[PDB]
Amino acid sequence: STDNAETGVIEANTDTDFGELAAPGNHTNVKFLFDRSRLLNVIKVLEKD
Amino acid sequence: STDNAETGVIEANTDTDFGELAAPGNHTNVKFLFDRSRLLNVIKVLEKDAVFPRPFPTQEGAQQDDGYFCLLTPRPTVASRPATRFGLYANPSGSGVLANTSLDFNFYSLACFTYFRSDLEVTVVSLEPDLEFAVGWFPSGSEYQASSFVYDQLHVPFHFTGRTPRAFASKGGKVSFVLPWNSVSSVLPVRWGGASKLSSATRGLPAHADWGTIYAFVPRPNEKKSTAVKHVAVYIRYKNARAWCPSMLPFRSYK
Amino acid sequence: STDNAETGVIEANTDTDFGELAAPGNHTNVKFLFDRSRLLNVIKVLEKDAVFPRPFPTQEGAQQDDGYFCLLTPRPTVASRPATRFGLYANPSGSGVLANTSLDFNFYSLACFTYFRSDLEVTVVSLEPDLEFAVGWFPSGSEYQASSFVYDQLHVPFHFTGRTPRAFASKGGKVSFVLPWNSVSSVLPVRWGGASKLSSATRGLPAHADWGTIYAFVPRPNEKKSTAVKHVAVYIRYKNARAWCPSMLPFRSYK
Amino acid sequence: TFCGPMMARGKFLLSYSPPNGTQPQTLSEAMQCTYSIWDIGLNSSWTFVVPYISPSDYRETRAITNSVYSADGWFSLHKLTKITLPPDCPQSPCILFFASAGEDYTLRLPVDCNPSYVF
Amino acid sequence: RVTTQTAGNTAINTQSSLGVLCAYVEDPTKSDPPSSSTDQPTTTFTAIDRWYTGRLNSWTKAVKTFSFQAVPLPGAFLSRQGGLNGGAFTATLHRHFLMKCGWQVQVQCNLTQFHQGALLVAMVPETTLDVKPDGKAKSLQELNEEQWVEMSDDYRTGKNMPFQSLGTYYRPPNWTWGPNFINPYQVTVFPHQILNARTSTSVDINVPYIGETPTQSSETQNSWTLLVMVLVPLDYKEGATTDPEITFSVRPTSPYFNGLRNRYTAG
Amino acid sequence: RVTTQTAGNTAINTQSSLGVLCAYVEDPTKSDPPSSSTDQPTTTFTAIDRWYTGRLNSWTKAVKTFSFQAVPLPGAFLSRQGGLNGGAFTATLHRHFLMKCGWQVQVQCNLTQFHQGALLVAMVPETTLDVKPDGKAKSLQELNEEQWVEMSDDYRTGKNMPFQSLGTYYRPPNWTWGPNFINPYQVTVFPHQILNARTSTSVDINVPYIGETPTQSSETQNSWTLLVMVLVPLDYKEGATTDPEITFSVRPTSPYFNGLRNRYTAG
């Protein structure tokens, strides 16, 4: 469709050209994604100052 | 009494011919029957980063690590991959490599429908005395990450860390947790007749009919490998199961 | 003035540029223009039962009676049959048989559309002095009845009687009557591009685009045949004519 | 988006072919499937939306066996006409490809990463 | 016992009839468009809203108990088995990727009162009998020599369905079971009717759409399979009549299509 | 001057456009089923509610004034001329006897400001230019050698259209005229648009259904013919650009079909 991407801010499915508006079905949320353990480093154990 | 069974739909106690209408006294419910644990498979325990088996056919002289990993599905499987024909090695010593196989005898003894769906609840039990281990799992359609990194000149396999769940159990402990139905297919086909690819496909072999994959490993560096093998047991349960259409039952010989 | 004729639909007197709007003062109406007589064709007069011409191609040595009968249509015709290419024998004496042809010059001089429809009003005029005759006509898709019967040892052609109209005119008289639009096709195609048959057809040759057929005969028995030939003239008119889409006009040479 | 001399002209055709036994090649084949025609003019940018059709509600993100659950056909670009380069404009314009996600995109299951970029 | 069903420009007559079996749910005709795609679908029209007809092998005394024949759907249309020719339906099928439809079939025979025997017809879902054990569909020429399929322990155990060869790396196991066995004694579970020689001549069933996804690929789906099996072997007095014949009719219901493209080709 | 028309699963874009010519009546889309038959007809559906595209010969300086090319409709679909492939529309056409539909076409060219010339496109009704004088349709191979048809006195007079040989019984007349002459100076009467090299690039027309009967045979009708003729011969400075190209698009509207049968065959 008509647009001008050189300007940067482009407009915004199949309802625009031919539509389909598949219903929603939030696993990408920032708060949710980053809450899970992961290894960081392995270190020795001291036995004196 | 008068009836016509050729039509199929027959009518429907002793009150009709001679009655007795014994009062009721729901143990056959689908939701209730399928909620109880049962063994699935027995697998080895890793001690280093492994190489996943290659897809069939596997030519002679191919280097890999076999005997580990295991699918989560009642349908027959071979070499940790989906299969159709169940088989076993009843013959004496031979040659080559023996392929691990599995199947849910109890499930198929009453699998009298076509389509099924339920949540899965996994647990793990050790066999050798005073053994320490851990478990890892990933969804369907994913892949197992290989290779290892060096920390203070110790080779730690990459599978120590990941976004997928991990479980660490104390010395001589046990593990348990419940996973969600995550396959793309809406329901699980007990028996199928389609094809997964446009060409070179095998009839009746489903693609992503499972719950995931599981493996076991020891929390030690690769620089402390041992010799004696170790084993682990697996059990599964079904939650809120449902069935969607009638079917047949396994044949019993008349010998 | 400003305009854009490339678009096709141009706008629309002297009041626009410099006006004059001369008051009106409908002689071009389609219904009015086409209501007037005009000659169509000249035909011989029968004196006995005749044999209708055979369909083309006609092989050498075929017995028939040619020169009589005539269609009622403006489109070109040959040998009393529909045709596409108009032709004439401008050459001197030759061989074989010469095919009578006809066409409506006046109609085609202003035939500037494709589809047409109207009622037809026929009349007949004699040429030879003190001549007695009669006329007969039948609809489109019908056939001319041949053979003759004997009455008191006189052979009377069958065409004396029939369910179709007949006209008897006094000595040195004239005939006239109006016929209805009777062809199966809804309208008359001035120019056509289809085919009438699934196979072996000729492109652009319509099937039943006409009003009927006409012939002339003398009320005498076959036992009184003469030698000298006779001729008759025909005129036609259109009533409540209508046109349905634009078209072109005949080309005029620049010589 | 187009990048070339202003006073040039041409016409392009965009196509999208669902899965088949063989990848369509000829323009005649391409025309029957879903398609559209792009005309060079004042605006040099055009957006083509790929419809989502599949036998399952969700689809896998990485393909190994190329099963119907991962692959979803092909996309192609065909030159309908011949580009007319105006005089004194040297030759050979260029086209830039821009891709993104639709307004109804979605992702479901997290997984582990690949640390290959560190080597 | 006398009724006729009219559809499109074709009709079917029944001198005898018990009714129509409606399968799992009442009014199988009702349906809705799928949900795993967005492009607008193609729906029913008069060209395809009509019946189709075909032929089967004859019935001979030599046939023994439990022998059977199968006709996959819609694969029968594509394979042109038994002379069935879908015409417009086949043409539309070859030009689409996704399909969803029901089915409605009827089978007739010409048994007379001077014959004894029985036949059983049922719509077994999600089965594979057409394919040879090698893993290739049974060809039309191969389907002629053997008129009826012989029941055997292999089929009963489901031990000979298509499989994948492991390769030289492994050792060949001993195959003994599979999830697509056939149990003759329990075939009546699926919707069916008994085509006895002394009660009626034509039987009919109505089934809805099923599948593990809202829509299935239009070039490989094999949801429903038509199965005919012999219970009581045919027998009659010599010299009376020889080897009756069989026929069947099909008609789709409320179909949907998606994913237009050129004609399907392989390679 | 920038607009796009969307139909089915396909769309067309126009960087320049004056509008759409609506031909004889407003809203050509409106229509009603025929009246010369009773069997229920087949109507439009998504599979056929879309555009189609094809190609024509190139334009070269050697071409002189009034030369032309013609594309019969719907005979172009059947003949597969210019690479046009109707697909579903052709398949449905070959399986019916009666048809009735409108038309809606657009033609585009790639002329640049550094070229001079003019083109004229019109929808001439009820004409026969495809056929050779012999009385046989022009083959695709024959249509290649001669890229453009040369205007001549014969065509101007309509003296060489198909005819019927009289036979040996008669003598051969001198053919001089026929009702299908071509008059170049008056072609603008039919709906048309001038495709000048300095004003626009794409032209389009909308036409309704016409014919001497409420419905016409689907295997021979030639109601509408697309005609392209050259008014001002092309000319440009040497070395700038060579021989632009031509294309066109078609789309039926509100069709009807009747008389189902098997695939058409001749003999």
Swiss-Prot record, chain D:
The chain holds residues 554 to 672 of 2181 of the full protein. Interacts with host entry receptor ANTRX1. Forms an icosahedral capsid of pseudo T=3 symmetry with capsid proteins VP2 and VP3. Together they form an icosahedral capsid composed of 60 copies of each VP1, VP2, and VP3, with a diameter of approximately 270 Angstroms. VP4 lies on the inner surface of the protein shell formed by VP1, VP2 and VP3. All the three latter proteins contain a beta-sheet structure called beta-barrel jelly roll. VP1 is situated at the 12 fivefold axes, whereas VP2 and VP3 are located at the quasi-sixfold axes. Vp3 also seems to be involved in the binding to host receptor ANTXR1 for attachment and uncoating (entry). This is Capsid protein VP3. The lineage of its organism: Viruses, Riboviria, Orthornavirae, Pisuviricota, Pisoniviricetes. It comes from the Viruses. It comes from Seneca Valley virus (isolate -/United States/SSV-001/2002). It is found in: Virion; Host cytoplasm.
